[PDB]
Amino acid sequence: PPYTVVYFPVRGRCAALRMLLADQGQSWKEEVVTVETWQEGSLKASCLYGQLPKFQDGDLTLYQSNTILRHLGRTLGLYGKDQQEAALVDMVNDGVEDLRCKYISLIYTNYEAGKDDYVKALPGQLKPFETLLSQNQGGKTFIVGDQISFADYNLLDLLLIHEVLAPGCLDAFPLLSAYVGRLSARPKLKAFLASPEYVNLPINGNGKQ
Amino acid sequence: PPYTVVYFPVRGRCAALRMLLADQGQSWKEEVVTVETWQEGSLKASCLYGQLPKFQDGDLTLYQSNTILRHLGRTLGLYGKDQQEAALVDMVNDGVEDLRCKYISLIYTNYEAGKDDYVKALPGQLKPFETLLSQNQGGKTFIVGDQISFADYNLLDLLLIHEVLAPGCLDAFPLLSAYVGRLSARPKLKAFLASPEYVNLPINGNGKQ
Ligand SMILES: N[C@@H](CCC(=O)N[C@@H](CS)C(=O)NCC(=O)O)C(=O)O
Ligand SMILES: N[C@@H](CCC(=O)N[C@@H](CS)C(=O)NCC(=O)O)C(=O)O
């Protein structure tokens, strides 16, 4: 176990990277931080931007969930076959991040009064991803190219958490639906998604989803 | 190359990539999109995520400002000397992006009532960058390593727009102050920042800054 993930006991911004590690057959150590430990102050005080996750790869300490993903994509060969693909992978990931931010604000700042709006606008937000798939070998493979990239794990998590928020939201999108099923069927990932370490963790830190 | 930048006639999310292109001796064509043109709908409907900027590098069309920056970073040698530096460059850029997002929400949604609170919390938001500089050879050169990266351009823009929003905000940060002074003095960058094509564009589209 050369990697260490320091985070709160929630899926949140660490779910995609955990899926990547699990699917890639990589070993890691989870350093769980409880709300109490956080409230004490010291740890937050040591974090670059005062937030988690924190990640250790040997002697290298990183912060920022997308920085961690790009790092693993870079060192594990999950960043496209060439520079042209690397750019498309980034483009996809940034799009995922944008929607993730909107999702986070809903959950933490206006879940009750904003849900219906969010849900009605959701299909307009998902359409771009359906488009990218239709444009890459008829959506029969990955989001970019013929190989899995760190953007697939991030997109998959986004899709999964949206199905929980708005059941059947992928029904109008044939390629996204098939994509989720296909990736979810990968043996190592399938086992992980069914394990207690994933299943018994809440999606968000406030219990809403 | 060559490159085509498609954006509204404002600095905004295109300022950093323009500074990079100018300073690194690149040439690009600016395709200005007027609000009247945007509101008509044809171009927007064509944009992957329904938003600008759009960037062309031959037949490679990209969207997402940070994707454009990383693309230029890896093709122009502005992404660190190795994998560890690349990770650090990403960490800095994601931090800049987080703060830029807060700045944009302030500008577009709560300028009048939220400015004071924002400014009061600004020192805490800038401290991590002052810290990063101190950890890199006492902050005598660049944000990461001893050669310029795309993160330097993005960070420079963030600091420039904050000095306009809150005059004197960098006075408390000696390393960040000196850093902005060094970078602004770079010949090509200096000339660009003094030119009409930069100076005569508003920072943000809604006329607030
Ligand atoms: N851009 C950062 C954001 C990290 C973040 O928002 N962390 C939250 C949890 S999702 C946190 O640490 N909150 C604790 C605090 O702000 O005190 C990333 O993507 O890693
Ligand atoms: N994550 C995108 C955000 C782009 C963005 O916010 N674009 C705005 C202008 S700054 C836009 O195109 N607004 C027009 C619209 O949404 O209709 C990026 O970083 O490029």
Tab-separated table of all heavy atoms in Angstrom, chain B residues 101-158:
chain	number	residue	atom	x	y	z
B	101	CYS	N	-13.626	30.726	-8.978
B	101	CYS	CA	-15.045	30.414	-8.899
B	101	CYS	C	-15.755	31.270	-7.849
B	101	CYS	O	-16.870	31.740	-8.084
B	101	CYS	CB	-15.271	28.933	-8.599
B	101	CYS	SG	-15.104	27.930	-10.059
B	102	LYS	N	-15.127	31.468	-6.696
B	102	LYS	CA	-15.728	32.297	-5.658
B	102	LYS	C	-15.803	33.757	-6.138
B	102	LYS	O	-16.794	34.453	-5.914
B	102	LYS	CB	-14.920	32.207	-4.364
B	102	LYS	CG	-14.968	30.851	-3.683
B	102	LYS	CD	-14.105	30.856	-2.412
B	102	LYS	CE	-14.143	29.513	-1.668
B	102	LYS	NZ	-13.598	28.365	-2.466
B	103	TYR	N	-14.746	34.214	-6.806
B	103	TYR	CA	-14.706	35.568	-7.333
B	103	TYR	C	-15.852	35.769	-8.337
B	103	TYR	O	-16.609	36.732	-8.238
B	103	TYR	CB	-13.351	35.825	-7.998
B	103	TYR	CG	-13.270	37.114	-8.779
B	103	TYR	CD1	-12.852	38.295	-8.166
B	103	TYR	CD2	-13.595	37.148	-10.140
B	103	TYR	CE1	-12.755	39.487	-8.884
B	103	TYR	CE2	-13.505	38.333	-10.873
B	103	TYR	CZ	-13.081	39.500	-10.238
B	103	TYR	OH	-12.967	40.673	-10.951
B	104	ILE	N	-16.004	34.832	-9.270
B	104	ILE	CA	-17.047	34.918	-10.289
B	104	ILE	C	-18.468	34.940	-9.714
B	104	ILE	O	-19.341	35.669	-10.210
B	104	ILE	CB	-16.859	33.810	-11.353
B	104	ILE	CG1	-15.682	34.182	-12.254
B	104	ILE	CG2	-18.124	33.610	-12.185
B	104	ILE	CD1	-15.165	33.045	-13.079
B	105	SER	N	-18.709	34.150	-8.673
B	105	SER	CA	-20.021	34.137	-8.055
B	105	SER	C	-20.274	35.461	-7.361
B	105	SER	O	-21.391	35.944	-7.352
B	105	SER	CB	-20.152	32.978	-7.083
B	105	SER	OG	-20.429	31.787	-7.803
B	106	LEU	N	-19.231	36.054	-6.794
B	106	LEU	CA	-19.364	37.345	-6.146
B	106	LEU	C	-19.728	38.394	-7.206
B	106	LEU	O	-20.720	39.121	-7.061
B	106	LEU	CB	-18.057	37.743	-5.454
B	106	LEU	CG	-18.056	39.198	-4.960
B	106	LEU	CD1	-18.998	39.340	-3.759
B	106	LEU	CD2	-16.654	39.664	-4.622
B	107	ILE	N	-18.946	38.433	-8.286
B	107	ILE	CA	-19.151	39.386	-9.385
B	107	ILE	C	-20.526	39.283	-10.052
B	107	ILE	O	-21.207	40.292	-10.257
B	107	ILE	CB	-18.059	39.233	-10.502
B	107	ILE	CG1	-16.674	39.572	-9.952
B	107	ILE	CG2	-18.394	40.093	-11.734
B	107	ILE	CD1	-16.539	40.964	-9.406
B	108	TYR	N	-20.949	38.063	-10.359
B	108	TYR	CA	-22.207	37.872	-11.049
B	108	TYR	C	-23.464	37.655	-10.236
B	108	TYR	O	-24.564	37.780	-10.780
B	108	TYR	CB	-22.071	36.756	-12.090
B	108	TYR	CG	-21.149	37.108	-13.243
B	108	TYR	CD1	-19.799	36.766	-13.205
B	108	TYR	CD2	-21.619	37.802	-14.361
B	108	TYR	CE1	-18.934	37.108	-14.248
B	108	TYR	CE2	-20.758	38.149	-15.416
B	108	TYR	CZ	-19.415	37.796	-15.351
B	108	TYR	OH	-18.537	38.106	-16.374
B	109	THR	N	-23.344	37.373	-8.946
B	109	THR	CA	-24.562	37.118	-8.188
B	109	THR	C	-24.770	37.857	-6.876
B	109	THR	O	-25.903	37.963	-6.402
B	109	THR	CB	-24.760	35.593	-7.931
B	109	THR	OG1	-23.776	35.113	-7.012
B	109	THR	CG2	-24.623	34.804	-9.213
B	110	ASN	N	-23.719	38.435	-6.319
B	110	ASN	CA	-23.873	39.085	-5.029
B	110	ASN	C	-22.852	40.186	-4.803
B	110	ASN	O	-22.380	40.397	-3.679
B	110	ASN	CB	-23.726	38.010	-3.950
B	110	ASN	CG	-24.194	38.477	-2.591
B	110	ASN	OD1	-25.047	39.366	-2.478
B	110	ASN	ND2	-23.634	37.881	-1.544
B	111	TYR	N	-22.548	40.928	-5.856
B	111	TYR	CA	-21.544	41.967	-5.747
B	111	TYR	C	-21.780	43.002	-4.659
B	111	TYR	O	-20.951	43.194	-3.762
B	111	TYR	CB	-21.357	42.666	-7.085
B	111	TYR	CG	-20.175	43.588	-7.068
B	111	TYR	CD1	-18.875	43.084	-7.159
B	111	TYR	CD2	-20.343	44.955	-6.917
B	111	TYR	CE1	-17.779	43.922	-7.099
B	111	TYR	CE2	-19.252	45.804	-6.856
B	111	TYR	CZ	-17.974	45.282	-6.948
B	111	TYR	OH	-16.898	46.129	-6.893
B	112	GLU	N	-22.929	43.655	-4.742
B	112	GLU	CA	-23.289	44.707	-3.807
B	112	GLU	C	-23.367	44.314	-2.328
B	112	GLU	O	-22.767	44.981	-1.483
B	112	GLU	CB	-24.586	45.392	-4.264
B	112	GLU	CG	-24.428	46.287	-5.515
B	112	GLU	CD	-24.191	45.517	-6.824
B	112	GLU	OE1	-24.754	44.407	-6.990
B	112	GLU	OE2	-23.460	46.041	-7.699
B	113	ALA	N	-24.046	43.208	-2.022
B	113	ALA	CA	-24.206	42.763	-0.642
B	113	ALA	C	-23.116	41.839	-0.114
B	113	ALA	O	-22.948	41.706	1.105
B	113	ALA	CB	-25.557	42.105	-0.471
B	114	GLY	N	-22.363	41.216	-1.014
B	114	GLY	CA	-21.333	40.294	-0.571
B	114	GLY	C	-19.884	40.733	-0.590
B	114	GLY	O	-19.039	40.073	0.024
B	115	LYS	N	-19.586	41.855	-1.241
B	115	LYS	CA	-18.198	42.313	-1.347
B	115	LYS	C	-17.410	42.423	-0.032
B	115	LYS	O	-16.301	41.891	0.078
B	115	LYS	CB	-18.120	43.626	-2.135
B	115	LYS	CG	-16.707	43.995	-2.603
B	115	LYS	CD	-16.772	45.103	-3.637
B	115	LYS	CE	-15.411	45.497	-4.204
B	115	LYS	NZ	-14.641	46.462	-3.360
B	116	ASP	N	-17.994	43.064	0.975
B	116	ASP	CA	-17.301	43.228	2.250
B	116	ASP	C	-16.901	41.905	2.899
B	116	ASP	O	-15.756	41.738	3.299
B	116	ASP	CB	-18.124	44.085	3.229
B	116	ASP	CG	-18.207	45.567	2.812
B	116	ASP	OD1	-17.313	46.066	2.083
B	116	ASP	OD2	-19.175	46.240	3.234
B	117	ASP	N	-17.817	40.949	2.951
B	117	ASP	CA	-17.506	39.659	3.551
B	117	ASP	C	-16.420	38.970	2.761
B	117	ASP	O	-15.515	38.379	3.335
B	117	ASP	CB	-18.736	38.754	3.593
B	117	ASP	CG	-19.716	39.135	4.694
B	117	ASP	OD1	-19.284	39.614	5.772
B	117	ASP	OD2	-20.931	38.939	4.480
B	118	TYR	N	-16.515	39.058	1.437
B	118	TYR	CA	-15.537	38.432	0.550
B	118	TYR	C	-14.147	38.973	0.839
B	118	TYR	O	-13.209	38.216	1.067
B	118	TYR	CB	-15.888	38.695	-0.920
B	118	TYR	CG	-14.966	37.999	-1.911
B	118	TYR	CD1	-15.315	36.758	-2.457
B	118	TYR	CD2	-13.753	38.577	-2.307
B	118	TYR	CE1	-14.484	36.107	-3.372
B	118	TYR	CE2	-12.907	37.923	-3.224
B	118	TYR	CZ	-13.284	36.690	-3.752
B	118	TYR	OH	-12.477	36.037	-4.658
B	119	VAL	N	-14.028	40.292	0.832
B	119	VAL	CA	-12.754	40.939	1.069
B	119	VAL	C	-12.176	40.599	2.450
B	119	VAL	O	-10.964	40.394	2.591
B	119	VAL	CB	-12.888	42.471	0.846
B	119	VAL	CG1	-11.563	43.173	1.109
B	119	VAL	CG2	-13.357	42.747	-0.585
B	120	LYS	N	-13.041	40.462	3.452
B	120	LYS	CA	-12.579	40.140	4.799
B	120	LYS	C	-11.965	38.742	4.859
B	120	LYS	O	-11.033	38.492	5.619
B	120	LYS	CB	-13.720	40.258	5.822
B	120	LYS	CG	-14.492	41.579	5.783
B	120	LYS	CD	-13.607	42.785	5.413
B	120	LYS	CE	-14.444	43.940	4.835
B	120	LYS	NZ	-13.637	44.917	4.039
B	121	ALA	N	-12.484	37.842	4.032
B	121	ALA	CA	-12.008	36.463	3.971
B	121	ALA	C	-10.872	36.249	2.965
B	121	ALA	O	-10.278	35.173	2.910
B	121	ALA	CB	-13.175	35.539	3.632
B	122	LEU	N	-10.549	37.280	2.192
B	122	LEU	CA	-9.514	37.174	1.171
B	122	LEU	C	-8.099	36.834	1.654
B	122	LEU	O	-7.409	36.033	1.025
B	122	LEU	CB	-9.521	38.432	0.294
B	122	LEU	CG	-8.803	38.342	-1.049
B	122	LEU	CD1	-9.336	37.161	-1.864
B	122	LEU	CD2	-9.005	39.647	-1.804
B	123	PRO	N	-7.649	37.402	2.786
B	123	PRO	CA	-6.291	37.072	3.244
B	123	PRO	C	-6.104	35.571	3.466
B	123	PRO	O	-5.080	35.003	3.099
B	123	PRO	CB	-6.180	37.838	4.556
B	123	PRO	CG	-7.077	39.012	4.343
B	123	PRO	CD	-8.272	38.398	3.676
B	124	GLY	N	-7.116	34.939	4.052
B	124	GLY	CA	-7.074	33.511	4.311
B	124	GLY	C	-7.034	32.690	3.035
B	124	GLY	O	-6.473	31.597	3.012
B	125	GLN	N	-7.647	33.215	1.980
B	125	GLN	CA	-7.677	32.554	0.680
B	125	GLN	C	-6.344	32.739	-0.073
B	125	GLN	O	-5.989	31.929	-0.924
B	125	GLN	CB	-8.819	33.138	-0.174
B	125	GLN	CG	-10.218	32.978	0.406
B	125	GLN	CD	-10.600	31.523	0.524
B	125	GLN	OE1	-10.488	30.773	-0.441
B	125	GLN	NE2	-11.025	31.104	1.715
B	126	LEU	N	-5.624	33.827	0.205
B	126	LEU	CA	-4.365	34.088	-0.481
B	126	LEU	C	-3.165	33.465	0.204
B	126	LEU	O	-2.166	33.157	-0.434
B	126	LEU	CB	-4.164	35.599	-0.649
B	126	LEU	CG	-5.171	36.367	-1.534
B	126	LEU	CD1	-4.808	37.851	-1.520
B	126	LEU	CD2	-5.196	35.835	-2.985
B	127	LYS	N	-3.281	33.233	1.503
B	127	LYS	CA	-2.181	32.650	2.269
B	127	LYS	C	-1.567	31.374	1.697
B	127	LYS	O	-0.341	31.220	1.730
B	127	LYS	CB	-2.582	32.448	3.732
B	127	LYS	CG	-2.698	33.762	4.476
B	127	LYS	CD	-3.348	33.629	5.847
B	127	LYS	CE	-3.779	35.008	6.358
B	127	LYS	NZ	-2.678	36.031	6.245
B	128	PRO	N	-2.394	30.436	1.172
B	128	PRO	CA	-1.760	29.225	0.633
B	128	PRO	C	-0.747	29.482	-0.485
B	128	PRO	O	0.285	28.814	-0.538
B	128	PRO	CB	-2.956	28.362	0.176
B	128	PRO	CG	-4.112	29.296	0.127
B	128	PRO	CD	-3.858	30.282	1.225
B	129	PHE	N	-0.996	30.498	-1.319
B	129	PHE	CA	-0.083	30.823	-2.424
B	129	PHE	C	1.211	31.436	-1.890
B	129	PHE	O	2.302	31.150	-2.399
B	129	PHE	CB	-0.773	31.714	-3.481
B	129	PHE	CG	-2.031	31.104	-4.033
B	129	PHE	CD1	-3.279	31.634	-3.714
B	129	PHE	CD2	-1.976	29.937	-4.790
B	129	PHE	CE1	-4.465	30.999	-4.134
B	129	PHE	CE2	-3.143	29.298	-5.215
B	129	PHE	CZ	-4.393	29.829	-4.883
B	130	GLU	N	1.088	32.237	-0.839
B	130	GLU	CA	2.249	32.832	-0.189
B	130	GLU	C	3.082	31.675	0.395
B	130	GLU	O	4.310	31.664	0.294
B	130	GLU	CB	1.784	33.786	0.922
B	130	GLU	CG	2.909	34.440	1.742
B	130	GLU	CD	3.614	35.591	1.033
B	130	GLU	OE1	3.206	35.972	-0.079
B	130	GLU	OE2	4.573	36.135	1.607
B	131	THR	N	2.391	30.687	0.968
B	131	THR	CA	3.031	29.497	1.547
B	131	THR	C	3.765	28.676	0.480
B	131	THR	O	4.905	28.261	0.691
B	131	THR	CB	1.994	28.585	2.259
B	131	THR	OG1	1.420	29.283	3.371
B	131	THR	CG2	2.660	27.311	2.765
B	132	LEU	N	3.100	28.422	-0.648
B	132	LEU	CA	3.703	27.665	-1.752
B	132	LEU	C	5.002	28.330	-2.225
B	132	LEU	O	6.034	27.675	-2.372
B	132	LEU	CB	2.705	27.542	-2.903
B	132	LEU	CG	1.559	26.550	-2.656
B	132	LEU	CD1	0.347	26.900	-3.499
B	132	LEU	CD2	2.032	25.136	-2.946
B	133	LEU	N	4.951	29.641	-2.445
B	133	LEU	CA	6.133	30.401	-2.847
B	133	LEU	C	7.278	30.227	-1.840
B	133	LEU	O	8.415	29.973	-2.239
B	133	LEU	CB	5.787	31.891	-2.971
B	133	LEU	CG	5.142	32.316	-4.288
B	133	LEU	CD1	4.642	33.736	-4.183
B	133	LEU	CD2	6.144	32.177	-5.410
B	134	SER	N	6.987	30.376	-0.547
B	134	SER	CA	8.010	30.218	0.486
B	134	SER	C	8.679	28.847	0.433
B	134	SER	O	9.875	28.714	0.694
B	134	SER	CB	7.421	30.445	1.879
B	134	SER	OG	6.529	29.408	2.242
B	135	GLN	N	7.912	27.824	0.084
B	135	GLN	CA	8.436	26.467	-0.010
B	135	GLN	C	9.267	26.224	-1.267
B	135	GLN	O	9.904	25.177	-1.387
B	135	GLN	CB	7.296	25.452	0.009
B	135	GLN	CG	6.474	25.428	1.266
B	135	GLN	CD	5.236	24.562	1.102
B	135	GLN	OE1	5.066	23.874	0.085
B	135	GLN	NE2	4.354	24.601	2.092
B	136	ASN	N	9.208	27.147	-2.225
B	136	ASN	CA	9.965	27.013	-3.467
B	136	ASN	C	11.102	28.020	-3.526
B	136	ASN	O	10.941	29.120	-4.056
B	136	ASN	CB	9.049	27.184	-4.686
B	136	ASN	CG	9.782	26.966	-6.001
B	136	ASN	OD1	10.809	26.287	-6.050
B	136	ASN	ND2	9.258	27.531	-7.070
B	137	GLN	N	12.243	27.650	-2.944
B	137	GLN	CA	13.438	28.501	-2.920
B	137	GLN	C	13.149	29.910	-2.422
B	137	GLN	O	13.503	30.898	-3.075
B	137	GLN	CB	14.089	28.564	-4.305
B	137	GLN	CG	14.709	27.245	-4.755
B	137	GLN	CD	15.746	26.719	-3.773
B	137	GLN	OE1	16.859	27.249	-3.677
B	137	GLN	NE2	15.385	25.673	-3.035
B	138	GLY	N	12.453	29.986	-1.292
B	138	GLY	CA	12.112	31.264	-0.703
B	138	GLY	C	11.270	32.163	-1.584
B	138	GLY	O	11.221	33.375	-1.369
B	139	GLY	N	10.611	31.574	-2.576
B	139	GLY	CA	9.767	32.342	-3.471
B	139	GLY	C	10.505	33.297	-4.389
B	139	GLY	O	9.926	34.284	-4.834
B	140	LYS	N	11.760	32.989	-4.706
B	140	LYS	CA	12.578	33.843	-5.570
B	140	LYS	C	12.372	33.668	-7.089
B	140	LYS	O	12.899	34.453	-7.891
B	140	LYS	CB	14.063	33.652	-5.228
B	140	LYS	CG	14.587	34.523	-4.085
B	140	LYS	CD	13.977	34.178	-2.737
B	140	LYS	CE	14.576	35.034	-1.607
B	140	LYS	NZ	13.835	34.921	-0.297
B	141	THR	N	11.588	32.671	-7.489
B	141	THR	CA	11.387	32.425	-8.909
B	141	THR	C	9.942	32.240	-9.345
B	141	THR	O	9.210	33.211	-9.489
B	141	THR	CB	12.233	31.221	-9.393
B	141	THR	OG1	11.915	30.057	-8.607
B	141	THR	CG2	13.730	31.525	-9.271
B	142	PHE	N	9.527	30.996	-9.558
B	142	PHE	CA	8.173	30.712	-10.016
B	142	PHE	C	7.345	30.002	-8.950
B	142	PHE	O	7.845	29.746	-7.853
B	142	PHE	CB	8.255	29.944	-11.334
B	142	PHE	CG	8.992	30.708	-12.396
B	142	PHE	CD1	10.347	30.468	-12.631
B	142	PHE	CD2	8.364	31.770	-13.065
B	142	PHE	CE1	11.078	31.281	-13.512
B	142	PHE	CE2	9.075	32.589	-13.941
B	142	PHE	CZ	10.435	32.349	-14.167
B	143	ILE	N	6.072	29.740	-9.232
B	143	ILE	CA	5.224	29.094	-8.236
B	143	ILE	C	5.669	27.645	-7.997
B	143	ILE	O	5.742	27.205	-6.852
B	143	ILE	CB	3.684	29.262	-8.554
B	143	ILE	CG1	2.836	28.897	-7.331
B	143	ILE	CG2	3.264	28.451	-9.768
B	143	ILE	CD1	3.014	29.813	-6.136
B	144	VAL	N	6.085	26.966	-9.070
B	144	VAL	CA	6.570	25.590	-9.008
B	144	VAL	C	7.866	25.453	-9.820
B	144	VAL	O	7.907	25.763	-11.019
B	144	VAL	CB	5.521	24.556	-9.558
B	144	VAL	CG1	6.128	23.156	-9.557
B	144	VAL	CG2	4.235	24.570	-8.729
B	145	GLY	N	8.920	24.983	-9.159
B	145	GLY	CA	10.199	24.784	-9.823
B	145	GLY	C	10.889	26.076	-10.233
B	145	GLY	O	10.511	27.168	-9.794
B	146	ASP	N	11.893	25.970	-11.099
B	146	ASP	CA	12.603	27.175	-11.503
B	146	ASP	C	12.464	27.588	-12.942
B	146	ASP	O	13.366	28.219	-13.514
B	146	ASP	CB	14.067	27.171	-11.064
B	146	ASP	CG	14.785	25.912	-11.440
B	146	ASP	OD1	14.710	25.508	-12.616
B	146	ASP	OD2	15.437	25.333	-10.548
B	147	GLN	N	11.332	27.210	-13.527
B	147	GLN	CA	10.991	27.602	-14.885
B	147	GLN	C	9.485	27.877	-14.816
B	147	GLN	O	8.788	27.348	-13.932
B	147	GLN	CB	11.390	26.555	-15.955
B	147	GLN	CG	10.636	25.217	-15.938
B	147	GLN	CD	11.287	24.158	-15.062
B	147	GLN	OE1	12.426	23.738	-15.307
B	147	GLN	NE2	10.559	23.703	-14.048
B	148	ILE	N	9.021	28.796	-15.661
B	148	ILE	CA	7.621	29.199	-15.688
B	148	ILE	C	6.699	28.057	-16.160
B	148	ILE	O	7.112	27.212	-16.958
B	148	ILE	CB	7.439	30.497	-16.555
B	148	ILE	CG1	6.106	31.177	-16.231
B	148	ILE	CG2	7.545	30.185	-18.037
B	148	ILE	CD1	6.010	32.607	-16.739
B	149	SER	N	5.497	27.997	-15.584
B	149	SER	CA	4.494	26.985	-15.938
B	149	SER	C	3.194	27.718	-16.254
B	149	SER	O	3.093	28.932	-16.016
B	149	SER	CB	4.274	26.009	-14.774
B	149	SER	OG	3.642	26.639	-13.666
B	150	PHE	N	2.193	27.000	-16.768
B	150	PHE	CA	0.922	27.641	-17.078
B	150	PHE	C	0.221	28.145	-15.802
B	150	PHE	O	-0.597	29.070	-15.859
B	150	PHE	CB	0.013	26.715	-17.906
B	150	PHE	CG	-0.557	25.545	-17.136
B	150	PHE	CD1	-1.735	25.678	-16.408
B	150	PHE	CD2	0.074	24.309	-17.162
B	150	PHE	CE1	-2.282	24.588	-15.718
B	150	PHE	CE2	-0.461	23.220	-16.482
B	150	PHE	CZ	-1.641	23.363	-15.758
B	151	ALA	N	0.541	27.539	-14.652
B	151	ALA	CA	-0.050	27.948	-13.374
B	151	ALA	C	0.383	29.382	-13.007
B	151	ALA	O	-0.374	30.116	-12.367
B	151	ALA	CB	0.336	26.966	-12.256
B	152	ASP	N	1.598	29.769	-13.395
B	152	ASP	CA	2.079	31.122	-13.124
B	152	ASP	C	1.173	32.142	-13.799
B	152	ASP	O	0.713	33.071	-13.165
B	152	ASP	CB	3.526	31.300	-13.584
B	152	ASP	CG	4.506	30.548	-12.707
B	152	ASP	OD1	4.617	30.887	-11.511
B	152	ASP	OD2	5.168	29.621	-13.208
B	153	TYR	N	0.833	31.906	-15.054
B	153	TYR	CA	-0.040	32.832	-15.768
B	153	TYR	C	-1.431	32.932	-15.121
B	153	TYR	O	-1.979	34.035	-14.968
B	153	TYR	CB	-0.156	32.442	-17.256
B	153	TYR	CG	1.145	32.577	-18.006
B	153	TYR	CD1	1.918	31.457	-18.304
B	153	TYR	CD2	1.644	33.843	-18.356
B	153	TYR	CE1	3.158	31.584	-18.921
B	153	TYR	CE2	2.886	33.983	-18.983
B	153	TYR	CZ	3.634	32.857	-19.257
B	153	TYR	OH	4.862	32.976	-19.855
B	154	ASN	N	-2.000	31.782	-14.749
B	154	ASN	CA	-3.319	31.748	-14.130
B	154	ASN	C	-3.303	32.441	-12.764
B	154	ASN	O	-4.171	33.258	-12.469
B	154	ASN	CB	-3.822	30.290	-14.027
B	154	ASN	CG	-5.340	30.183	-13.926
B	154	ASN	OD1	-5.867	29.151	-13.502
B	154	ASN	ND2	-6.051	31.224	-14.326
B	155	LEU	N	-2.286	32.165	-11.959
B	155	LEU	CA	-2.160	32.786	-10.640
B	155	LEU	C	-1.969	34.305	-10.782
B	155	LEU	O	-2.598	35.084	-10.062
B	155	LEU	CB	-0.987	32.180	-9.862
B	155	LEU	CG	-0.706	32.785	-8.476
B	155	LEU	CD1	-1.970	32.828	-7.622
B	155	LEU	CD2	0.415	32.037	-7.771
B	156	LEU	N	-1.142	34.713	-11.739
B	156	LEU	CA	-0.887	36.135	-11.983
B	156	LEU	C	-2.192	36.871	-12.298
B	156	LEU	O	-2.457	37.943	-11.758
B	156	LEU	CB	0.124	36.326	-13.118
B	156	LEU	CG	0.460	37.796	-13.440
B	156	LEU	CD1	1.042	38.483	-12.215
B	156	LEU	CD2	1.406	37.889	-14.617
B	157	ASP	N	-3.019	36.284	-13.160
B	157	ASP	CA	-4.288	36.913	-13.498
B	157	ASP	C	-5.188	37.028	-12.265
B	157	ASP	O	-5.833	38.055	-12.046
B	157	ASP	CB	-5.016	36.141	-14.603
B	157	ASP	CG	-6.396	36.729	-14.911
B	157	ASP	OD1	-6.487	37.894	-15.336
B	157	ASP	OD2	-7.400	36.040	-14.704
B	158	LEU	N	-5.235	35.971	-11.463
B	158	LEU	CA	-6.073	35.976	-10.272
B	158	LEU	C	-5.687	37.119	-9.328
B	158	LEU	O	-6.553	37.834	-8.809
B	158	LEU	CB	-5.974	34.626	-9.546
B	158	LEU	CG	-6.900	34.429	-8.337
B	158	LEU	CD1	-8.316	34.199	-8.827
B	158	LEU	CD2	-6.435	33.239	-7.496
